[PDB]
Amino acid sequence: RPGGDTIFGKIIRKEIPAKIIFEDDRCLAFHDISPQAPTHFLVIPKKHISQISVAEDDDESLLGHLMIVGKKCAADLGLNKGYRMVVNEGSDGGQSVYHVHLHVLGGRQMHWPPG
Amino acid sequence: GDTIFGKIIRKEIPAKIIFEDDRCLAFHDISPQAPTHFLVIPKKHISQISVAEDDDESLLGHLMIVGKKCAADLGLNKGYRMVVNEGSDGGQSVYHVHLHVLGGRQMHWPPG
Ligand SMILES: CNc1nc2c(ncn2[C@@H]2O[C@H](COC(=O)NCCc3c[nH]c4ccccc34)[C@@H](O)[C@H]2O)c2nccn12
Incomplete structure (x- = not known):
């Protein structure tokens, strides 16, 4: 099972439904089930990384891709006044699923x- | 147009620098909102994340790798939050891309 067996791994493999905005070979963008703003979505890698604090050096381009995808999807969703991107790490960051994810x-x- | 973050990169005004390499700079925020609050910025003047080029994708990822290495070095073992703000709704304070940690x-x- 590529993607891991966090809930986000199950979403990647289409085992749990999600409202998917964008998908490529590297990542997936989908709406958050508990939105904290009018628009609130996640961008995740298809590669399982548990948390940013254990990302490999050669995960640099992947992490950057999450941000590029995030900004493209924000434009496609009409977020013309702006937006905030957030990555949470660990307990103090408020991380609730241990599969790296970018909130937008x-x-x-x-x-x-x-x- | 130039910003205060350009001045910091050029070493024209003081900042408490945490890390530097050939393509980015990490420094403590002057208005910290947590006991540890620092920025990681590219040396390239990208005004805002919305105008980042595809070619910039590894540079952007480099900011987050530098950020997580700096966070570890600064003893943030219980966790942290990384933030990029875009535009007025995002509360972007300086039009030079910056990652908050x-x-x-x-x-x-x-x-x-
Ligand atoms: C999109 N579909 C989906 N999303 C989920 C699910 N289960 C959690 N998600 C979403 O993933 C994000 C993970 O956030 C964090 O890891 N930190 C964000 C901050 C945070 C989340 N939980 C906390 C608990 C305490 C403090 C802070 C936080 C959250 O915004 C959830 O809404 C889920 N099941 C079935 C389908 N699900």
């Missing part, structure tokens, strides 16, 4: 601090 |  939130004014 | 406290949800 928009459609309202985001506030400071970012939690 | 915050930790040393529980970060909350929603992330603003």
